[PDB]
């Protein structure tokens, strides 16, 4: 959930208003970008 | 009171979302695996009052459908609100009134409702649907979460060997009904339809434990492990 | 909404609403407050709800703030307690033209005192200390249900306000309540945007081998993204 | 503090109401996870 | 909270409250605006 109301994005769009969603989906984008940066860091160490 | 062991029972489907070939971990109120549960055998009569303790797993082994239903309530009298489950040959009646129960709410002797309740005040609920209920093992899980009554049921006949023992097998309990009762279920008591017969029923209490459920293909929970066992 | 007879706060009545379209637009047409939690108010129409429960009661105007998540008070702790994580709307409107008399209103009462705090979505329809009351009034004894005694000459914070709480769950069950949205014919084996029971996504829809049990309405992947859906019109 | 009102968890739970804390403690949790991801990344590089 | 004459905004009165037990439930007794910064209203009695 990454500190949001749901993991899916289309619920947060439908359930919450556009200003309110941009707070939840910014958290979700930050969490998924952190996880992807962790994956490209660990894959770079494994590649070394 | 006699105590027996629940070997792997008490596992239900936690949510109404299919999952297949997935080992999913859920933290919810479940019956701890390998747990001591109370065993009551009736042919004096064992119809006692038992507390709820945020979840009840009920399992009954019988032939003649003696164990018809249950009552749920706080103080089990007419000053407070109470639930009722009554099953007969046509249907089942789930009814939430302010019942004045008798001390021995034996159903019928037929004498119909008879001494299960004396009066109904501020009755607000009446769900009537298809009835809930060699030996036949009938398993029930009762949860009262945020004013919603959740019943999980599974019917599967079992064999004897040692007399009156819970079986050593894994059977997931399918959700049956969700009710907005909005009452405080603190205590409960089963109902026995007295009329040559035999019945035995098992009561276990749920605890908040993490379970790793083994969904496979066909979407059935076939195995699970208690994390804190 | 348009009912002359409502319910007292201590014995609030909860109305099951299911198997129908709910046009929230009519409520917007009706002097009214529409504060919603979990769903924002404008987005209610394009959604499908599992079950809609209406909690109808009458309180004063200053006690509307007590009907809130995480809120402690008289009405919140002793009459009607709300959960911290529900999904629903609170609707409050002034009805002093129908719920106020010159002598007073003994139809609606409130539980003034209680032994313990009351758990959310529960209803109590039932002694401070020292001597026991034993069914009679005495020292440190009170009739917990006290009358509101409404009058039209009272202040606005003490005027009778009629509050209904619409509670529901989302994407956890087969949805009996849906918004008034026109249906579209189903096509398979094509890349098409889809809105099944309020779930919006772009995907190719194909016949599925999975046999959903009657309770199951959706299938979830290991990423918690719906991988299969049961069509509402045709199962 | 990671932009929150305090570094420690307990005054943020005792001071702020649950909706407001869930944002402040999420900001602390994300930052503490970042510091602990930085430590694990630097331990992986030094272990290599 | 109750004064026959509140002070004017240009010369606001500052009252020091100390060495006592404060219950904030009484305030809500008196249309009430109660906006709290850095803290929430319910948690004050804790
Ligand atoms: C369960 O009950 C049996 C017999 O009543 C006893 O031998 C056993 O020790 C009990 N188990 C626990 C965990 O108390
Ligand atoms: C079973 O109970 C229902 C509910 O009242 C009743 O209408 C029906 O007649 C009963 N059937 C019997 C007693 O065979
Ligand atoms: C799943 O369904 C198939 C039917 O094609 C059946 O052969 C198989 O035994 C089922 N699996 C389980 C675990 O029941
Ligand atoms: C339910 O009833 C019990 C009776 O002891 C009472 O103490 C408690 O406050 C109530 N709890 C709930 C779940 O409302
Ligand atoms: C309405 O929906 C039901 C689903 O149970 C379906 O069987 C029926 O054919 C539908 N009728 C029309 C006119 O679409």
XYZ file of C-alpha atoms and ligand atoms in Angstrom:
676
model
C 0.000 0.000 0.000
C 3.082 2.256 0.539
C 1.183 4.297 3.116
C -1.823 4.849 0.831
C -5.423 3.656 0.878
C -4.915 0.969 -1.794
C -2.167 -0.458 -3.979
C -4.155 -0.088 -7.219
C -4.156 3.307 -8.915
C -7.589 3.303 -10.654
C -9.429 3.003 -7.300
C -7.570 6.000 -5.913
C -8.525 7.922 -9.058
C -12.211 6.864 -8.926
C -12.653 6.985 -5.089
C -10.743 10.212 -4.360
C -10.959 13.719 -5.941
C -8.114 14.904 -8.240
C -6.329 17.137 -5.619
C -6.719 14.397 -2.927
C -5.389 11.595 -5.210
C -2.222 13.547 -6.165
C -1.215 13.086 -2.509
C -1.745 9.310 -2.510
C -0.321 8.596 -5.961
C 2.744 10.780 -5.330
C 3.480 8.573 -2.288
C 2.910 5.471 -4.452
C 5.220 6.797 -7.207
C 7.893 7.636 -4.596
C 7.668 4.143 -3.072
C 7.797 2.356 -6.433
C 10.687 4.562 -7.614
C 12.543 3.745 -4.368
C 11.957 0.010 -4.976
C 13.097 0.304 -8.604
C 16.213 2.264 -7.569
C 16.932 -0.478 -5.006
C 16.605 -3.066 -7.844
C 18.989 -1.173 -10.227
C 21.490 -0.680 -7.318
C 21.445 -4.362 -6.296
C 21.580 -5.454 -9.948
C 24.590 -3.165 -10.480
C 26.380 -4.695 -7.469
C 25.493 -8.193 -8.725
C 26.704 -7.170 -12.200
C 30.039 -6.091 -10.706
C -14.993 -30.222 30.884
C -13.416 -32.562 28.337
C -10.781 -31.111 26.016
C -9.808 -32.304 22.545
C -7.351 -31.147 19.901
C -8.000 -29.171 16.720
C -5.397 -30.642 14.392
C -5.494 -28.284 11.383
C -9.076 -26.987 11.335
C -10.416 -23.463 11.662
C -9.018 -22.049 8.408
C -11.416 -19.956 6.328
C -11.211 -17.821 3.216
C -10.270 -14.347 4.514
C -11.555 -12.282 1.569
C -13.805 -12.626 -1.515
C -10.967 -12.338 -4.103
C -9.897 -15.511 -6.019
C -6.161 -16.343 -5.755
C -4.645 -19.429 -7.391
C -1.192 -21.109 -7.190
C -0.156 -18.384 -4.601
C 1.186 -18.728 -0.982
C -0.488 -15.620 0.558
C 0.135 -14.444 4.122
C -2.861 -12.997 5.988
C -3.096 -11.594 9.516
C -6.624 -12.044 10.857
C -8.575 -13.721 13.632
C -8.046 -17.484 13.071
C -8.180 -20.631 15.263
C -4.633 -21.463 16.373
C -3.481 -24.802 14.861
C -3.050 -27.698 17.360
C -5.312 -25.938 19.943
C -7.277 -27.407 22.937
C -11.024 -26.971 22.234
C -13.953 -27.852 24.473
C -15.902 -31.008 23.623
C -19.523 -31.314 24.765
C -21.375 -34.610 24.324
C -25.143 -35.005 24.771
C -27.265 -38.145 24.460
C -28.215 -34.312 32.821
C -27.584 -32.406 29.586
C -24.567 -30.358 28.504
C -26.073 -27.104 27.206
C -23.836 -24.502 28.875
C -23.179 -20.797 28.422
C -19.910 -19.952 26.743
C -18.142 -16.617 26.145
C -17.475 -15.364 22.633
C -13.890 -14.006 23.055
C -13.699 -12.129 19.674
C -14.373 -15.248 17.600
C -15.896 -18.725 17.914
C -15.113 -21.796 15.820
C -18.023 -24.232 16.099
C -17.866 -27.817 14.835
C -20.584 -30.434 15.326
C -20.668 -34.172 14.596
C -24.193 -35.580 14.536
C -26.661 -37.717 12.603
C -30.228 -36.628 13.424
C -29.648 -32.812 13.170
C -30.113 -32.347 16.926
C -27.958 -29.207 17.152
C -30.232 -26.771 15.342
C -28.920 -23.299 16.074
C -27.313 -20.841 18.456
C -28.055 -17.709 20.454
C -25.654 -14.791 20.760
C -25.995 -11.903 23.251
C -24.386 -9.802 25.939
C -26.287 -10.855 29.073
C -28.807 -13.252 27.385
C -31.972 -11.605 28.711
C -34.579 -9.111 27.558
C -32.860 -5.952 28.827
C -30.157 -6.229 26.149
C -30.268 -6.993 22.438
C -29.558 -10.581 21.380
C -29.257 -12.648 18.161
C -30.972 -15.979 17.411
C -30.368 -18.733 14.855
C -33.163 -21.309 14.479
C -33.075 -24.041 11.841
C -35.945 -26.366 10.903
C -37.041 -28.589 8.026
C -37.970 -25.705 5.717
C -35.455 -22.905 6.270
C -33.303 -21.042 8.792
C -34.402 -17.970 10.774
C -31.699 -15.526 11.871
C -33.515 -13.037 14.072
C -32.138 -10.193 16.272
C -34.716 -9.136 18.901
C -34.462 -8.420 22.721
C -35.412 -12.079 23.555
C -36.177 -13.313 27.057
C -34.500 -16.714 26.853
C -35.337 -19.625 29.109
C -32.606 -21.379 31.080
C -32.924 -24.490 28.884
C -33.834 -23.213 25.343
C -34.389 -26.754 23.962
C -36.060 -26.462 20.523
C -39.482 -28.129 19.955
C -40.246 -31.102 22.268
C -43.181 -30.649 17.000
C -43.585 -27.829 19.638
C -41.916 -25.295 17.223
C -39.942 -22.424 18.882
C -41.309 -23.431 22.336
C -38.973 -22.361 25.198
C -36.169 -20.799 23.070
C -37.531 -17.243 23.718
C -40.465 -15.804 25.753
C -40.791 -12.195 24.434
C -39.425 -9.929 21.632
C -38.786 -6.177 22.212
C -37.347 -3.699 19.657
C -36.848 -6.528 17.103
C -34.845 -5.006 14.175
C -33.616 -8.004 12.096
C -35.132 -11.026 10.242
C -32.933 -12.792 7.650
C -34.664 -15.928 6.339
C -32.898 -17.969 3.652
C -31.917 -21.530 2.760
C -31.136 -23.647 5.864
C -27.580 -23.891 7.151
C -27.545 -27.567 8.144
C -23.380 -42.232 9.467
C -22.150 -38.867 10.760
C -22.037 -35.394 9.210
C -19.342 -32.854 10.336
C -20.654 -29.259 10.139
C -18.120 -26.506 10.817
C -18.915 -22.871 11.622
C -16.778 -19.793 12.310
C -18.400 -16.732 13.901
C -16.715 -13.320 13.762
C -18.152 -10.044 15.067
C -16.003 -7.321 13.489
C -17.093 -3.604 13.489
C -20.740 -4.567 13.959
C -20.717 -7.092 11.085
C -21.448 -10.769 11.810
C -19.461 -13.057 9.505
C -20.345 -16.758 9.273
C -18.003 -19.180 7.492
C -19.400 -22.668 6.933
C -18.284 -26.009 5.497
C -20.100 -29.361 5.430
C -18.121 -32.622 4.959
C -19.076 -36.113 6.374
C -16.386 -37.837 8.561
C -15.567 -41.414 9.794
C -15.318 -42.827 13.409
C -12.388 -45.147 14.504
C -11.807 -43.682 18.016
C -15.326 -42.470 19.094
C -16.238 -38.735 18.682
C -12.774 -37.343 17.570
C -12.193 -34.205 15.374
C -10.726 -35.470 12.052
C -6.994 -34.969 11.074
C -7.533 -33.256 7.670
C -7.414 -29.769 6.058
C -10.826 -28.300 4.936
C -11.188 -24.528 4.177
C -14.467 -22.857 5.321
C -16.310 -20.919 2.565
C -17.919 -17.536 3.612
C -21.707 -18.100 3.951
C -23.373 -14.838 5.052
C -22.437 -11.372 6.321
C -24.953 -9.713 8.635
C -25.134 -6.075 9.922
C -26.359 -7.179 13.401
C -24.816 -4.131 15.233
C -25.085 -5.819 18.717
C -22.446 -6.741 21.362
C -21.900 -10.582 21.175
C -20.163 -11.372 24.521
C -21.709 -14.761 25.416
C -23.371 -17.534 23.415
C -25.238 -20.818 23.840
C -26.124 -23.579 21.404
C -29.619 -25.023 20.938
C -30.511 -28.708 21.225
C -33.673 -30.129 19.642
C -34.855 -32.564 22.287
C -37.523 -35.060 21.232
C -32.962 -42.252 20.971
C -30.214 -40.023 19.606
C -26.672 -38.750 19.973
C -24.842 -35.488 19.302
C -21.473 -33.890 20.010
C -20.210 -30.384 19.340
C -16.887 -28.561 19.613
C -16.195 -24.918 20.509
C -12.917 -23.148 19.804
C -11.933 -19.508 20.177
C -10.129 -17.491 17.518
C -6.941 -15.493 18.118
C -5.209 -12.828 15.993
C -2.534 -14.905 14.247
C -0.687 -14.672 10.874
C -1.483 -17.560 8.522
C 0.328 -18.392 5.284
C -2.421 -19.915 3.131
C -1.505 -22.229 0.236
C -3.717 -21.396 -2.622
C -3.293 -23.796 -5.530
C -5.028 -24.277 -8.850
C -8.894 -24.408 -8.754
C -8.584 -21.603 -6.179
C -8.977 -23.775 -3.062
C -7.066 -23.365 0.189
C -5.515 -26.809 0.600
C -2.813 -26.140 3.203
C -1.801 -23.398 5.674
C 0.805 -22.899 8.471
C 0.394 -20.921 11.733
C 3.344 -18.460 11.840
C 3.378 -18.265 15.665
C 2.969 -22.088 16.289
C -34.545 11.311 3.548
C -38.194 12.379 3.130
C -39.504 10.642 6.250
C -41.449 12.400 8.998
C -40.542 9.778 11.620
C -36.791 9.300 12.291
C -34.957 7.609 15.225
C -33.413 8.659 18.594
C -29.565 8.810 18.668
C -29.187 6.036 21.326
C -31.394 3.668 19.247
C -30.319 4.830 15.749
C -31.914 2.698 12.988
C -29.586 1.330 10.245
C -31.377 0.764 6.871
C -30.008 -1.937 4.501
C -29.867 -0.582 0.893
C -29.068 -3.088 -1.883
C -30.014 -4.379 -5.368
C -30.836 -0.904 -6.730
C -29.250 2.091 -8.422
C -28.605 5.009 -6.072
C -28.693 8.436 -7.701
C -26.783 10.572 -5.195
C -27.675 13.533 -7.480
C -31.138 13.791 -5.799
C -29.485 14.436 -2.376
C -27.348 17.253 -3.903
C -30.616 18.850 -5.164
C -31.888 18.896 -1.526
C -29.985 23.280 2.679
C -27.701 20.303 3.572
C -24.093 19.350 4.416
C -22.377 16.545 2.421
C -18.995 15.887 4.118
C -17.691 12.472 2.995
C -14.796 10.285 4.241
C -13.011 7.618 2.193
C -14.792 8.705 -0.990
C -14.847 12.370 -2.017
C -18.503 13.510 -2.596
C -18.399 14.227 -6.399
C -17.004 10.735 -7.295
C -19.890 8.734 -5.661
C -21.973 8.307 -8.888
C -19.274 6.461 -10.944
C -18.817 3.791 -8.228
C -20.365 0.488 -7.191
C -20.901 -0.293 -3.503
C -21.242 -3.683 -1.823
C -24.020 -2.612 0.573
C -25.316 0.829 1.560
C -26.247 1.258 5.224
C -28.092 4.383 6.361
C -27.658 5.320 10.099
C -30.495 7.841 10.749
C -30.618 9.861 13.976
C -31.380 13.328 15.361
C -28.863 15.373 17.369
C -28.131 19.026 18.099
C -26.128 21.297 15.818
C -23.022 21.433 18.002
C -22.892 17.625 18.267
C -22.481 17.115 14.496
C -18.707 17.492 15.004
C -18.830 14.555 17.446
C -19.940 12.233 14.625
C -16.422 11.884 13.223
C -13.523 9.398 13.044
C -11.259 9.553 16.086
C -13.602 11.928 17.923
C -14.395 11.754 21.644
C -17.500 13.276 23.179
C -20.910 12.578 24.641
C -22.716 11.387 21.490
C -19.585 9.751 20.052
C -18.660 7.676 23.096
C -22.135 6.935 24.495
C -24.660 7.022 21.613
C -23.181 6.479 18.126
C -19.506 5.643 17.589
C -17.910 5.844 14.118
C -14.918 3.733 13.027
C -11.528 5.206 12.245
C -11.409 3.609 8.742
C -14.975 3.501 7.377
C -15.953 4.475 3.835
C -19.007 6.706 3.707
C -20.722 10.067 3.970
C -22.149 12.051 6.882
C -25.206 14.125 5.936
C -26.608 16.648 8.408
C -29.393 19.143 7.832
C -31.503 21.386 10.045
C -35.117 20.241 10.460
C -36.470 22.431 13.268
C -39.752 22.835 11.307
C -40.521 19.118 11.833
C -38.646 18.195 15.043
C -39.420 21.067 17.451
C -42.504 21.718 19.585
C -43.422 24.491 22.012
C -43.616 22.220 25.065
C -40.789 19.907 23.989
C -39.929 16.690 22.138
C -40.066 13.482 24.178
C -39.913 11.323 21.036
C -36.116 11.666 20.740
C -33.711 10.997 23.629
C -29.979 10.485 24.187
C -28.023 8.274 26.581
C -26.312 10.776 28.879
C -24.211 8.346 30.938
C -22.747 4.887 30.388
C -20.331 2.553 32.154
C -17.824 2.205 29.300
C -17.056 3.654 25.886
C -19.096 2.158 23.056
C -17.455 0.284 20.177
C -17.962 1.502 16.561
C -21.082 0.527 14.566
C -22.841 -0.773 17.686
C -26.155 0.136 19.308
C -27.120 0.021 22.999
C -30.867 -0.003 23.686
C -30.669 -0.840 27.407
C -25.027 3.335 38.297
C -22.320 5.929 38.919
C -21.203 4.273 42.147
C -21.643 4.084 45.943
C -25.140 2.696 46.660
C -26.776 0.504 43.986
C -29.717 2.039 42.165
C -31.805 -1.210 42.078
C -34.168 0.166 39.440
C -34.923 3.379 41.359
C -33.385 6.842 41.386
C -31.113 7.676 44.290
C -27.652 8.923 45.265
C -25.114 8.651 42.403
C -27.916 7.196 40.197
C -29.251 8.538 36.849
C -31.838 7.597 34.180
C -29.185 7.482 31.356
C -31.722 8.347 28.649
C -32.420 12.091 28.843
C -34.791 14.021 26.598
C -33.589 16.706 24.103
C -36.700 18.899 24.855
C -36.430 20.700 21.430
C -38.016 24.183 20.887
C -38.142 26.465 17.826
C -36.877 29.373 19.959
C -33.534 27.687 20.712
C -30.176 28.660 19.279
C -28.888 27.211 16.018
C -26.325 24.996 17.751
C -29.145 23.538 19.857
C -31.652 23.238 16.988
C -32.672 19.697 15.897
C -30.364 18.501 13.120
C -31.248 15.229 11.265
C -28.056 13.233 10.455
C -27.882 10.182 8.194
C -24.615 8.277 7.773
C -24.232 6.337 4.517
C -21.645 3.592 5.037
C -20.369 1.148 2.419
C -17.433 -1.028 1.392
C -15.571 -0.904 -1.916
C -14.042 -3.659 -4.142
C -14.351 -6.433 -1.530
C -17.616 -8.190 -2.472
C -20.124 -8.532 -5.313
C -21.580 -5.032 -5.484
C -25.337 -4.921 -4.939
C -25.426 -1.103 -5.237
C -24.214 0.650 -8.382
C -24.364 4.146 -9.801
C -26.809 5.026 -12.604
C -24.371 4.370 -15.464
C -25.605 2.898 -18.777
C -24.303 -0.547 -19.685
C -22.142 -1.392 -22.700
C -22.143 -4.652 -24.674
C -19.270 -7.006 -23.891
C -16.671 -7.884 -26.536
C -13.817 -10.373 -25.947
C -10.325 -10.994 -27.475
C -9.898 -7.204 -28.074
C -7.878 -4.445 -26.309
C -10.728 -2.429 -24.704
C -11.012 0.003 -21.748
C -13.377 -1.621 -19.187
C -15.491 -0.461 -16.185
C -16.767 -3.650 -14.457
C -18.622 -2.797 -11.189
C -16.632 0.454 -10.736
C -13.250 -1.147 -11.594
C -11.618 0.807 -14.472
C -8.695 -0.615 -16.511
C -7.455 -1.109 -20.103
C -7.001 -4.806 -20.973
C -7.789 -7.704 -23.348
C -10.761 -9.671 -21.899
C -10.813 -13.456 -22.618
C -12.843 -16.461 -21.322
C -11.188 -17.707 -18.087
C -10.677 -21.337 -16.892
C -10.808 -20.140 -13.220
C -14.032 -21.238 -11.499
C -14.906 -18.457 -9.032
C -16.943 -19.659 -6.020
C -20.167 -17.573 -5.554
C -18.552 -15.252 -2.935
C -15.519 -14.540 -5.217
C -16.176 -11.680 -7.715
C -12.562 -10.712 -8.595
C -9.242 -12.565 -9.106
C -6.037 -10.991 -7.740
C -2.452 -11.384 -9.087
C 0.660 -11.563 -6.809
C 0.972 -7.767 -7.467
C -2.637 -7.339 -6.133
C -3.838 -6.241 -9.608
C -7.175 -7.767 -10.717
C -6.318 -10.604 -13.167
C -9.909 -11.871 -13.667
C -13.416 -10.353 -13.169
C -16.885 -11.978 -13.141
C -19.203 -9.951 -15.452
C -22.132 -8.586 -13.351
C -24.881 -8.916 -16.043
C -23.738 -12.424 -17.148
C -21.855 -14.571 -14.589
C 13.241 14.572 12.068
C 12.983 14.011 8.270
C 10.640 16.993 7.982
C 8.302 15.775 10.724
C 7.614 17.609 13.974
C 9.915 15.353 16.019
C 12.509 12.619 15.637
C 10.953 10.213 18.158
C 7.721 8.303 17.455
C 5.924 8.728 20.770
C 5.305 12.481 20.862
C 3.973 12.350 17.295
C 1.487 9.668 18.361
C 0.559 11.505 21.582
C 0.297 14.974 20.020
C -1.314 14.536 16.603
C -4.560 12.760 15.746
C -4.380 9.447 13.775
C -4.964 10.848 10.216
C -2.271 13.585 10.662
C 0.254 11.199 12.300
C -0.062 8.614 9.471
C 1.487 11.257 7.164
C 4.211 12.340 9.627
C 5.188 8.796 10.643
C 5.102 7.747 6.961
C 7.594 10.579 6.275
C 9.791 9.292 9.144
C 9.416 5.617 8.012
C 10.357 6.417 4.368
C 13.420 8.410 5.504
C 14.552 5.719 7.996
C 14.110 3.086 5.224
C 16.255 5.354 2.954
C 19.023 5.668 5.583
C 18.859 1.842 6.086
C 18.931 1.293 2.275
C 21.982 3.585 2.079
C 23.665 1.527 4.827
C 22.840 -1.805 3.139
C 24.067 -0.492 -0.248
C 27.383 0.771 1.233
C 27.777 -2.561 3.126
C 27.224 -4.446 -0.147
C 29.833 -2.311 -1.954
C 32.389 -2.698 0.882
C 31.574 -6.446 1.042
C 32.340 -6.691 -2.687
C -12.475 32.474 28.529
C -15.363 34.470 30.173
C -14.615 38.227 30.649
C -17.000 41.217 30.905
C -14.647 43.005 28.459
C -12.077 41.153 26.275
C -8.864 43.094 25.443
C -8.534 44.923 22.062
C -6.420 43.290 19.271
C -3.840 46.162 19.285
C -3.121 45.495 23.000
C -3.984 41.779 23.463
C -3.988 40.495 27.086
C -1.513 37.618 27.777
C -2.494 35.475 30.809
C 0.130 33.033 32.183
C -1.444 29.653 33.051
C 0.802 27.499 35.182
C 1.122 25.253 38.237
C -2.309 23.706 37.683
C -4.061 20.757 35.984
C -5.731 21.903 32.722
C -8.861 20.153 31.386
C -9.670 21.334 27.807
C -13.159 19.677 27.764
C -14.666 22.778 29.514
C -13.708 25.038 26.556
C -16.022 23.130 24.147
C -18.959 23.928 26.508
C -19.452 27.557 25.270
C -20.618 27.776 17.150
C -17.079 27.024 18.407
C -13.874 27.360 16.322
C -10.939 25.316 17.721
C -8.085 25.162 15.135
C -4.959 23.530 16.669
C -1.418 23.745 15.217
C 1.332 21.297 16.180
C -1.222 19.245 18.150
C -4.828 17.980 17.844
C -7.759 18.933 20.200
C -8.568 15.395 21.516
C -4.932 14.695 22.605
C -4.637 17.820 24.862
C -5.912 16.012 28.045
C -3.100 13.453 27.504
C -5.013 -30.206 26.434
O -5.791 -31.129 27.243
C -5.146 -32.388 27.502
C -6.126 -33.227 28.292
O -7.212 -32.446 28.771
C -3.825 -32.157 28.237
O -3.156 -33.401 28.407
C -2.941 -31.192 27.452
O -1.763 -30.896 28.192
C -3.690 -29.894 27.139
N -2.866 -29.008 26.334
C -2.498 -27.788 26.737
C -1.649 -27.007 25.780
O -2.834 -27.334 27.827
C -39.992 -23.837 9.481
O -39.901 -22.456 9.950
C -40.612 -21.493 9.153
C -40.332 -20.135 9.750
O -41.355 -19.741 10.652
C -42.098 -21.846 9.122
O -42.783 -20.922 8.285
C -42.283 -23.265 8.598
O -43.659 -23.624 8.649
C -41.466 -24.266 9.422
N -41.598 -25.609 8.873
C -42.013 -26.686 9.561
C -42.371 -26.476 11.009
O -42.098 -27.790 9.032
C -8.525 -29.160 -9.947
O -9.513 -29.439 -10.978
C -9.154 -30.519 -11.857
C -10.233 -30.607 -12.911
O -9.703 -30.372 -14.209
C -8.992 -31.811 -11.052
O -8.574 -32.858 -11.920
C -7.968 -31.612 -9.939
O -7.902 -32.776 -9.123
C -8.331 -30.404 -9.071
N -7.314 -30.177 -8.058
C -7.557 -30.273 -6.746
C -6.393 -30.004 -5.842
O -8.666 -30.565 -6.311
C -20.019 -5.297 25.486
O -20.558 -5.717 26.737
C -19.596 -5.820 27.777
C -20.227 -6.499 28.986
O -19.227 -6.774 29.973
C -19.155 -4.405 28.094
O -18.273 -4.391 29.219
C -18.419 -3.853 26.888
O -18.167 -2.463 27.106
C -19.200 -4.010 25.590
N -18.190 -4.009 24.555
C -18.443 -3.704 23.292
C -17.804 -4.613 22.279
O -19.139 -2.751 22.992
C -30.311 -9.250 -16.055
O -29.248 -9.869 -15.272
C -29.449 -11.269 -15.017
C -28.335 -11.715 -14.099
O -28.806 -12.631 -13.120
C -29.482 -12.027 -16.344
O -29.728 -13.405 -16.091
C -30.575 -11.458 -17.244
O -30.536 -12.092 -18.517
C -30.415 -9.944 -17.424
N -31.520 -9.404 -18.200
C -31.356 -8.519 -19.189
C -32.608 -8.071 -19.883
O -30.249 -8.096 -19.508
